[PDB]
Structures are given as structure tokens and as C-alpha cells.
Amino acid sequence: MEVIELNKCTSGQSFEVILKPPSDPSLEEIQKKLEAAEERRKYQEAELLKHLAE
Amino acid sequence: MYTFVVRDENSSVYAEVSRLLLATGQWKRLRKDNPRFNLMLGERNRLPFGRLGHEPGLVQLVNYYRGADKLCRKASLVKLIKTSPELSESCTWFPESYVIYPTDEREVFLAAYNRRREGREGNVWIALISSEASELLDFIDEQGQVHVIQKYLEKPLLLEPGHRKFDIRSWVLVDHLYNIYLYREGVLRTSSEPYNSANFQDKTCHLTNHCIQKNYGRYEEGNEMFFEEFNQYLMDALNTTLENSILLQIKHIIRSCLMCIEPAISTKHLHYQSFQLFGFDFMVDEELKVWLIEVNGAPACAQKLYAELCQGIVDVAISSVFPLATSIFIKLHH
Amino acid sequence: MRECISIHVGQAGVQIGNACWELYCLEHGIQPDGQMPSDKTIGGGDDSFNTFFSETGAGKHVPRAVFVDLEPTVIDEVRTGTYRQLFHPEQLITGKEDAANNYARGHYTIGKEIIDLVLDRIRKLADQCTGLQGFLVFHSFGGGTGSGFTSLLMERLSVDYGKKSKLEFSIYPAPQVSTAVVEPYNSILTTHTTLEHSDCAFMVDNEAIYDICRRNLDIERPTYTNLNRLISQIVSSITASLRFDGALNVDLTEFQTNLVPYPRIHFPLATYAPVISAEKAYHEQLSVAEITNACFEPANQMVKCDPRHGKYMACCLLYRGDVVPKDVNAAIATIKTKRSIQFVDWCPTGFKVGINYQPPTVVPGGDLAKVQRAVCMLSNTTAIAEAWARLDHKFDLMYAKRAFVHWYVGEGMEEGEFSEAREDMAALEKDYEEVGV
Amino acid sequence: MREIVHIQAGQCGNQIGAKFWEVISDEHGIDPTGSYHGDSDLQLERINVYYNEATGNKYVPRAILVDLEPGTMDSVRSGPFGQIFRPDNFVFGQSGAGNNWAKGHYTEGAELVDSVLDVVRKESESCDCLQGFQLTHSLGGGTGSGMGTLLISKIREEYPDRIMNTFSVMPSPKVSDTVVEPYNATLSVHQLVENTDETYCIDNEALYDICFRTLKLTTPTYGDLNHLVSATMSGVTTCLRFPGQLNADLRKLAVNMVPFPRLHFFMPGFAPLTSRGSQQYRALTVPELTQQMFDSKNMMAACDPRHGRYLTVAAIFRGRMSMKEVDEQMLNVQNKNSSYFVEWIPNNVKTAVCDIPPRGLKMSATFIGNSTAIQELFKRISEQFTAMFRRKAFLHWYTGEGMDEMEFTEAESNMNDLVSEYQQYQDA
Ligand SMILES: Nc1nc2c(ncn2[C@@H]2O[C@H](COP(=O)(O)OP(=O)(O)OP(=O)(O)O)[C@@H](O)[C@H]2O)c(=O)[nH]1
Ligand SMILES: Nc1nc2c(ncn2[C@@H]2O[C@H](COP(=O)(O)OP(=O)(O)O)[C@@H](O)[C@H]2O)c(=O)[nH]1
Ligand SMILES: CN[C@H]1CCc2cc(OC)c(OC)c(OC)c2-c2ccc(OC)c(=O)cc21
Ligand SMILES: [Ca+2]
Ligand SMILES: [Mg+2]
Ligand SMILES: [Mg+2]
């Protein structure tokens, strides 16, 4: 009902129409969890090569 | 071969619907959590409407309308009638009702109560039935629930012989296309103990409920008067028919209520479709005026009428969407 | 003027990137070689388009885009395609072995070996920027690269560019469109890890786009090209305000302000009208009223859900073509009386309208017909949580039996991350329900 | 993620293996000499997956031919497409394995394994990006069974991150060479459970039954059985060999087909079933292919899918057809048989389409099923095993090679474990 903040130009126009009023981890912390996953992979591969050696 | 799932086994109506579908030999029942169904006979609470209509190669249908609880909860119904311009606000067929919260519109409830005090007349209300406001305004805090104070119908229609009170239950089916089908057979849930207006404290004559009063079976089987017998009574005792004096108002109330919520609940352009069976509860006064009391989302049918209604639900709500390899309903045209 | 960098991760992000940058070039009048004849300031400028394009001495207009995939074959089609000259070879980064539909493989295993290289090529574009405002990130929820590598990148971009805004264009998985079976897992894991790093995310359900292509474009089996050309139209509508003169959504910060009052609930629903087949012989051109009314039909949304059973927090209308404020306000007034539009008590019931007079540009020989007027509505409704509920249920079914989990654990990921991701999603679903009812 | 190294071990492995290279060389337009003579560019676009490009221009199969006996490989070399294979890739002993797993795995085969692995390394180094290995072999004999599994173990040591893929032919009393086949098979299954990502269970019983009941051949030879194997092998490798809608590799297949690491034994299927030489006149409609490929009569593993539940399903349609009709029919099978597909893996059936049809058919369908019904195959082998083992019968052939009774007990236990593991997901 109320048309506010009307702004016009050559390209177009913009406005607001109101009907009713109202009633991060560190660089080291990232590299730590990535290397913790790399070591878990390396342990699983070591357990595999141990099994294959047996 | 169409497929269905059952997710409410406490449902008397849809237990009969399920077995009727299986007996055709063209429907197969799946386990609760199987997503690959055509039809869902769903649960009463927390129904997962967000999971429907996302199975490719399956037309999916549910026996509940999402948002229909807004008509089916006592607190919600009052808010709907008061706010919606279709029904607002001095509604001729709905008793004066006020939403009451325990720790709200109870400051404006007292203003109309004082009009009933200054103008010396009847001032009886229902919640259990109260005599005065302050005597049961702490009763909502006693139970700790959000309940409605509604105007009590002091002068109701009385059946003879017996001097009795009654409510009418009508069963209404809204299909996927939003056709409003009223089932031709209704039931009068009758009181057996004669109505007393001098003191309102006894349970038998005042409360109209089937489960509470179980006097029982004196005038008819299980306090249940059917439509042919009640029409016959009106012809003899009042020189009028059921369709003229009562049923036209019933048809008006049903259609007015469901046309109001149509934009909010309709599944016309949706990826899944809905039907629903409703239970409309009516009250008739001395001047033959029909009043709405309650709308039921999950209604239970009368014992005599199960076979016919459940076949009717299969006929026009299920078989219309999923066709197989006179009508018992009155279509309410809008 | 403030520049914007677009990041395209995995197959979905790359091919959608192709579709968008093709469309931008047609819109701004930039040729396949990168020449823009309408541009008069040779080799530089601070115009509205310069937000997305930079300039070289030879008058070449190059996208502020980085393409990243863990496998060569898709970006190799960008390297040899019709827009090969448009991009710098350093902008197009490819690995050797893909993430095999595995989040953990994309995030942890192959993620680690490429993350530092990608951030260097991002820094090389950021050093060309006089005033960086942030990033527009394109990916799938479903793929291993799209889920895994994106969430790692989004973590690192928060570290290196803390003052900068990050927007997502995310492809939500659909069984209809070539879906891997473990895609619910990948979707949940990437949503959890990205949720605090993303300012505003636009979800695009492949199911919705597939059906719009069937229903409105008359294509019986839509290909990726069919889907992406439609997606790029929606993306173009959303980004137009950054690329053109205007006063609504002029920077990435304004997307947060106008659309996201609650930081976690940062998934606006997009609805687009009209989608008209180019093969359609006789078409009655639709009015302002008709296209705005079509913004409230579920069949037009980017995600299939029911806004009537939910609450709005914000609503933007973005028009392209022959549209004037008078017609918009008349349309809104008619729609408000007939449709179920409920806002939250702590928000004004209202619409922020932006009009661009240039009608939407369609790719020559495409599937979309030329229209006189078009609209994209962006509304932050709680109804979109339906998509989370659908996805969480699928996650729950598989995880209860620990199905496929071993593939993730075998890449170094602990099992506890699955349940940590699911708890966050259970919290997110509860946030939506608090606001919504 | 392009190159696959192919290995064929023993009599059965080399006979089915030669037929595989015969069929896919015809599909890729490569003559018996090695030169390309086709009409489409689609035949050459992903030819590097199975072939090495030698300057000529000629195409040499990335295939290694292994046996402890020189017999079969001389028949392969003098066979139809025999002169296409790199002569250095022919690695053979002289003594044979005498249908003895122990000879293949521990004694005779151990002597020859290193020479094979040198040829494998020579092929692996030429690969721009090696995705994995595929083995063709029987489980019933000595070389393919014993040495084949020894090879798998040693390849996994040198290439622990690569995908191991097998086409493993299962023994049957119906098509039986020796009584010791259940011993050799049980020992081999133990190894396959541990050391492979994907195993195509090709039951000889099922191949016989198809040849007898459906193909109407009174006395089928191994050649009739091998026609069905190569046609299935062509079908399962279609997405690796041709450019299509999807970038498809062996790892992505493994991730999506195998929900639990041990349960990676697949039922292969083919539609329509054809006898060799006999021309297919009537074209099948899309509903007919879909009905036939899911039919138990078309399965290459003699298990009834109705006795189990499908964990995952892969389907490959070949030929010029409506992809909408394919999508509709595939959804129709699932929605009308939904109990037979596990509800706890959503959308577990995936479908691909390739435009190029196989030789002599206008449209075909290849089925890959990870069903819990495969336990029937393993139970059968276990029953035959226990019948002999309870009396320690024929065991001296193995104990004479160094083996102890304990290793037989351990193999019996591991296979009975796999059976009960399949049963775990058939009910719950
Ligand atoms: N709309 C659209 N969706 C796509 C496109 N490509 C893939 N998808 C979807 O994205 C999901 C798979 O993710 P991809 O992006 O293919 O995987 P990826 O990011 O390359 O990761 P990898 O697993 O390493 O291949 C599926 O749900 C597909 O339907 C595309 O071009 N357009
Ligand atoms: N399908 C098929 N099975 C075979 C073939 N040759 C042998 N077999 C089966 O393989 C088993 C014997 O293995 P074989 O490969 O001859 O022994 P190896 O040479 O020591 O590996 C028996 O179970 C036979 O039924 C063949 O050409 N095709
Ligand atoms: C559409 N996504 C595919 C990727 C993996 C895949 C590879 C493949 O070639 C080796 C193949 O043909 C045998 C496939 O089957 C069509 C798949 C495929 C595999 C199975 C699926 O599990 C049900 C899946 O989710 C994804 C696909
Ligand atoms: Ca300029
Ligand atoms: Mg990829
Ligand atoms: Mg032999």
C-alpha cells in the first residue's frame, strides 16, 4: 500500500512496498584435521601391508 | 496393481477402507516405511506431507489435507471464524466463543459478559459447563490447557417422548478436485436422561457425547437416531421435513467452512494430492436453527453405516484418482 | 565499483558456469573472443559489468571466474569449446583422479593435494581487484568434488578473506537426474561443514528443473544442457543487479540484509515466470499480474514445497522487461487478497521490487522463447525445510544400517562426523519449525 | 582414470578372455591383425581404456595371458584374434596345476608369479592414469583359482589403491571336470572376499541351464557357455568402453554397488538370450528387455532373486531406443516389486543407455545385481565342500603340496560367515 525508497535510472527502477508493519576455525585447525585424516589412512594402509606380509 | 500404506491402525474407518481395497485384487498393501506407494492412509499426528509427491513414476495421494487442522481444533476454529471476512464476525450459525490461555481475549470476554449482566437474561457458558465467569476462569489454569469459553445453548430442541437433548453428526468427503460430498446418512447422538435447566452439574442430560453416557439404549440402539426416523418425528410433531428445517442450514455451514479454507489447503496444482473425511457436529435449538459445535479431522463412523461410507470413500476419493480395470453423496455446489 | 569472483566446483558447477557466462556475454554484448564493441573505455573501467569482467590492453573482457574439477574431461570441453579464448588457462584448474562420489575423498584425500594451488589462482584474480566484496560459488550437493572440495574451499576462504561475502548456488540431488546412491550422505556432510561459512545459498532441486522442462518446454527427457540453460536464466536474474545499473541488491552484503535476517536460515526459495517453449507456435504474451501470480505456484519454484504451510521472513521481486511500478503494486494487492501469504511477527509484510527494462536474453537456438516481461521472486520461506526433511530421511535410512560408511572411513574420515552432520541438520530443521509455526 | 589392465589365468580364464577380446574388438572395429577398420568416431574415443596405441597405426590389447600349462595359450595364439596380443604378455609354465589350488597358489604358481608381475608393471607404467585391474578365471581348477588369487594378493600389495575387478566362473557338478572343485572354489572365495572390490559371479550351472532350457541346445559345449560369458562381459563394460551420458569408472561403480566391503559379489544378467549363429529376427520392445533382464532365467548366477533382496542394481541398455520408455519401465519394475529392493538404500536401481548396439542385436540389456540371494551359490559350494571334508577325502593332493587341514577349516568358516552376513540384510 505504501511505496517507499523509489529510485529510477535509464536501465530500470527499484522500490519497496510495505503492506503491514511488524507486530570460524583457524588455518592451523584446518590443517590439523586434514593431517589427522591422512594419518588414519596411513595407519589403515600399514595394517594392510602388515596383514599381507603375514 | 496400485499400492497403499497404512500409518494409523487406530483408525476405525481406514481399517475398513484398507480391506475393501485388498478385496478388489487390484491393490497391494506395503510396509509402513516403503516410499513406493500410490496411496497413503496416514497418521493423525506429525504426518510427513513434505515427503509426498517426490517419487517419480508414482501419482501419490493422501487421506489428509495439510492445514485442515485449522478447522478441526477448537481454538483454531474460533480464530478462523473471527478473522476470515467470509465468516467474520457476528456469525449467525456459530455460538459466541472466546480463546482463553492459562499462565488471549478474556478482557473482551468480560465486556460481553457484563452486557449479559446489565441486560438481565441467560448467562450460561461451556468450556465443562459453568454457572458464572469467575467460578471457572481459574479452571483453565486448573487443567493447564488452552480451551475455549463458548456460549451454551440454553433453549435446545427437545425430542418426544423423553424431553431429550441431541447433536447431529454429518460425514463430509472432500476429494482431490475439492468437490464437497455430504453423505446422505447422518446420526443423532441422543441424551436419554431428560434435560434439566435449573441446575447444570449432572453429566447425563447436559453432555451429548456417545462415550461418556454408557438410561443407555432406552429409546433406540446405543442412543443413535437415524435420518429416516428423525424426519418422521419432525413430520408428526412439528409439521416439517429434515431437509427444509435443518439440512439446508447444515449444507450452508459445511460449504461456508470449506470454501473459506480452500485457498490454503487445496492440492489442485500440487505435486501430491489430498482427500479428507470430516465430521461436522451440529446443534438444533427450539426455533429450528442449526449451530456448529465441532469439526473432526479423524471422525469415526456409526456402526450401521461403516460398509456404505467406506465403499463411498473408495468410490469417489480413491477410484477417481486410481481407476479399476446411484451415488450415496450429495454434492455441495459452489 | 566492487568486483565479484565466481567459483565453479565439480561437473555441475562447471557446466552451469558455462551456461551462465555464455548468457552474461550475450547480455552485455561480449563476443566469444572477449571483444565488447559497446564499451568505449578500452583496457579498463569501473562500470557495472566490471564487477564480473576484467579488461586487458587489447580490449578483451575476461570473466572473474575460476573453474575447478578433480578430473580433466569436463573442463577440457571448456578449454576447447566455443568460449575457449574468453578464459585464461590459469583460471581453469584440473586434477587427475576424481572424488568418486565420495565426500571424504574430495574433502580429505584429493582435497589436500590441490587446495593450496586453487587459492593461489583465486589470489591471482583477487590481486586484480580494487575492492573485493566476495565470492559466488557453484557446485552440486551430490558429487564428491561438489560436496567435499567445496566445503574445504569455503573453510579456507573464511580464513583468507574474512571481510568478504560468500554466496552459494547449490544443486540439490534428484533420483530422476543421473544420481549416485550416496548423494544424501554427501549433501548432509557438505551442508554441515559449509553452513557457518555461507552467507546466502540458492538451492536448485534438479527435480523441479526437470519437471519445468517437461511441463513448460515440452522436452520429454531433459539433458544437462536443457537444465543448465534454464538454471542460468534464474542465476542471471539474481546476479543482474550486480552487473547492471540499479539500486536493489547492488552488493553481496545487501543479499544478506534483504533476504537473510537469521544467519543459519540462509536458503531463499527462487520462483521464476514465465518459462515458454520456443517451439510453441502461438503464444499469448503474459502480463505483470499473471507472471507475479505465477511466483506463488509451487510448479514454478526451484524447490518443490508449499509456502502456504510456512512463514516468510523476506521477499524480493526481480523483474526483467516491460514492467512499471503501478502494474506491480496492482498485481500484489490482488494476490494478497486471494493467496496465503503469512509473514513472521518480527518482520514487515512487504516486497522489495527491482525492475530492469531490458527483457531477458535467450540463447539463440535454445529452448526458451523470447518474452516481453519476466520475473524471479526470491523469498525466504520456512517451507524450504521440506527439502531438508526429505534429504535427512534418506540419510537416516542408509546410516541406520551403516551402509556405504566404510568408503568414507577408508578416506580418513571418522564415523562421528556423520552423526555430527546429522545433529546439525536436526538442529537446522528445528530452527525452521520454531520460526515457521 | 582411463586405462584398465586385463589378466586371464588358466584354461577357463584364457578361453573366456580370448572371447571377450574377440567380441569387443569387433565392437571397436579392430581387425584380427590389429588395424582399425570402422566407420564411427565413437568406436575410438575411449579405446585407450582397453587398448594401447602402438605406432603403426595399430591397437594392442592391454592383456596379460597367464597359465601354468602351455596348451590353452597355444590354442589362443592360433585362434581367431590370437595375433592381436603383445607376444611378451604370454607368460606360461610347463608343469600345469592338475586342478589343484595349492599348486597354483603355493608351489608351481609361486615359481611363475614374479614373471607375470613384471609384465603387469610394464603395462601399468605405460598407463597415463591406471584405474584398475580385471581378471578372468575359473574358481574350480588350479591355475585360475590358485595362481589367479595369488596374483590378486600380490597386485594389491604393489597397487593398494587401485580397483580389483574379477569375472569368476563358479564350478558346478552339472559341468564338472574333477571332484575337487568345491575345495578349490572355497579356498578361492576366501581370497576374493578379502582382496577384490567387484566380483562377477558367473555360475556354470546357470550357463548350462540357459543353454539347455532357453537356447534349446541338447548337449552344450564350453563354447556355448562362453558365448553367454563374452556377451555379458561386453555388456558390463559398455560404460567404460563408449562415450555416453556419464563419466563411468570402476571406482564409482564400486562405491555405488558395494554398501558393505565383503558383499561385492554380483549376479550378471543378459537380455535377450541368444544361441551362437542363430539370427535374432524379431526386435524386442523396451518392456520386453526390462522384463527379461530381471527374470531369473536370464541370470548368470543360479540363484533365485525372489529368495533374496536387492541391495543395489545396475542396468545398461544398448541400442537406439526411447530413454523415456527405459525410465518408465525401470521405474515400473521397482514400483510393482518394491519388497524385493531394500528400503534402507533409497533409489538403489540405476540405469545407463548406450546408442551403439552389440553384434547381431538391435537392442540389448545387461543386468548387474547385488542381491542377498547370491548366498545360495555359496551355500551350494559349502554343502559340496562339507560332504567331502567331513571324511577328509581327496585332501592328500593338497597336504602333499604343504597345506594343512586348518586352512581348509578357516576357508569353510570365512565362507559360512559371508553367507550369514548376506542373511543379516535379507530380513533386517
Ligand atoms: N543441473 C545440473 N546438475 C548436474 C550437472 N552435472 C551433475 N549434476 C548433478 O550433480 C550430482 C553429481 O555431482 P557432480 O557435480 O556430477 O560430481 P562432481 O562434483 O564432479 O564430483 P565427482 O564425484 O568427483 O565426480 C548429481 O545429482 C547430478 O544430477 C549439470 O550439468 N547440471
Ligand atoms: N564357462 C566355462 N567354464 C570352464 C571352461 N573351461 C573350464 N571351465 C570350468 O573351470 C573349472 C576347471 O578350471 P580350469 O580353468 O580348466 O583349470 P585351470 O586351467 O587350472 O585354471 C571347472 O569348474 C570347469 O567347469 C570354459 O571354457 N568355460
Ligand atoms: C550414474 N552414476 C553411475 C556411476 C557409476 C557407474 C559406473 C558404471 O560403469 C562401470 C556403470 O555401469 C556398469 C554403472 O551402472 C549404470 C554406474 C552406476 C552404477 C550403479 C549405481 O548403483 C545403484 C549408481 O548409483 C550410479 C551409477
Ligand atoms: Ca571499460
Ligand atoms: Mg566429476
Ligand atoms: Mg581344465
Side-chain angles (χ1 to χ4, degrees), chain C residues 244-298:
Chain C
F244 291 100
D245 200 350
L248 185 64
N249 301 337
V250 287
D251 63 40
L252 299 172
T253 313
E254 216 189 320
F255 278 100
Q256 294 157 239
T257 307
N258 298 333
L259 298 161
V260 191
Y262 281 165
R264 277 172 67 91
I265 303 155
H266 64 266
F267 303 93
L269 186 68
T271 319
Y272 191 83
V275 183
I276 301 304
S277 173
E279 305 311 306
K280 204 181 174 193
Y282 179 74
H283 172 66
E284 294 172 348
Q285 288 290 321
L286 296 162
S287 66
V288 171
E290 292 172 308
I291 65 166
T292 313
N293 193 53
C295 284
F296 297 93
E297 291 281 271

Side-chain angles (χ1 to χ4, degrees), chain B residues 151-170:
Chain B
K151 183 76 188 72
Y152 190 81
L153 281 134
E154 293 172 53
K155 213 93 174 74
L157 190 78
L158 303 140
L159 291 152
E160 298 303 330
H163 209 81
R164 302 144 76 187
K165 211 202 204 202
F166 70 92
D167 75 276
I168 305 161
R169 161 71 77 82
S170 281

Side-chain angles (χ1 to χ4, degrees), chain C residues 101 178-182 404, chain D residues 198 200 235-240 245-257 311-316 347-352 368:
Chain C
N101 309 143
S178 308
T179 225
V181 82
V182 295
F404 305 95
Chain D
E198 298 138 346
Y200 298 95
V236 302
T237 58
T238 309
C239 295
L240 302 160
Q245 49 156 317
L246 72 168
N247 194 71
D249 63 72
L250 295 168
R251 188 168 287 115
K252 273 172 176 174
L253 180 73
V255 180
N256 289 301
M257 285 296 291
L311 304 166
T312 55
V313 178
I316 308 97
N347 315 109
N348 64 342
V349 186
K350 290 296 145 55
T351 321
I368 303 159

Side-chain angles (χ1 to χ4, degrees), chain D residues 152-168:
Chain D
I152 289 164
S153 193
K154 284 195 153 74
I155 286 154
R156 200 192 175 183
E157 198 181 49
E158 207 171 300
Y159 310 90
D161 63 326
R162 305 272 78 93
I163 297 296
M164 183 52 74
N165 185 56
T166 65
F167 297 88
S168 302

Side-chain angles (χ1 to χ4, degrees), chain D residues 32-216:
Chain D
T33 326
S35 300
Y36 173 76
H37 274 277
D39 54 72
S40 182
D41 288 300
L42 295 147
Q43 287 179 294
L44 289 166
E45 215 188 82
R46 235 197 294 188
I47 205 160
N48 276 309
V49 177
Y50 281 93
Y51 297 80
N52 280 308
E53 206 169 321
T55 43
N57 204 55
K58 282 166 83 71
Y59 293 94
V60 175
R62 206 172 293 102
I64 301 147
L65 299 90
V66 187
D67 211 330
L68 288 159
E69 208 161 57
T72 312
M73 273 162 63
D74 286 331
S75 291
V76 167
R77 190 145 43 205
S78 64
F81 271 82
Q83 284 170 56
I84 207 156
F85 302 108
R86 186 181 159 88
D88 291 305
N89 290 26
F90 286 81
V91 196
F92 63 100
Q94 295 289 330
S95 301
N99 296 295
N100 196 312
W101 194 85
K103 292 199 171 188
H105 204 81
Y106 293 126
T107 60
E108 305 295 328
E111 210 181 321
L112 188 72
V113 75
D114 275 28
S115 329
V116 180
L117 288 163
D118 292 329
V119 177
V120 175
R121 210 176 291 103
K122 196 166 74 201
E123 292 288 348
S124 290
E125 278 161 17
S126 302
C127 302
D128 179 53
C129 185
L130 180 70
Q131 53 173 308
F133 305 89
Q134 65 169 49
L135 174 74
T136 58
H137 69 144
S138 65
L139 305 187
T143 310
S145 198
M147 200 191 170
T149 52
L150 179 73
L151 256 159
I152 289 164
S153 193
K154 284 195 153 74
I155 286 154
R156 200 192 175 183
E157 198 181 49
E158 207 171 300
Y159 310 90
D161 63 326
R162 305 272 78 93
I163 297 296
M164 183 52 74
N165 185 56
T166 65
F167 297 88
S168 302
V169 172
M170 305 288 176
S172 179
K174 286 185 184 170
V175 204
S176 184
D177 291 327
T178 61
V179 291
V180 291
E181 279 160 15
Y183 285 155
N184 298 332
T186 307
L187 291 159
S188 277
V189 168
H190 194 312
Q191 299 292 311
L192 297 177
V193 164
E194 280 207 314
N195 293 339
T196 71
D197 300 293
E198 298 138 346
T199 292
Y200 298 95
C201 300
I202 302 156
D203 204 336
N204 255 2
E205 196 158 305
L207 304 172
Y208 185 86
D209 292 335
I210 290 159
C211 282
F212 190 75
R213 296 166 182 166
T214 308
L215 267 50
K216 304 291 183 194

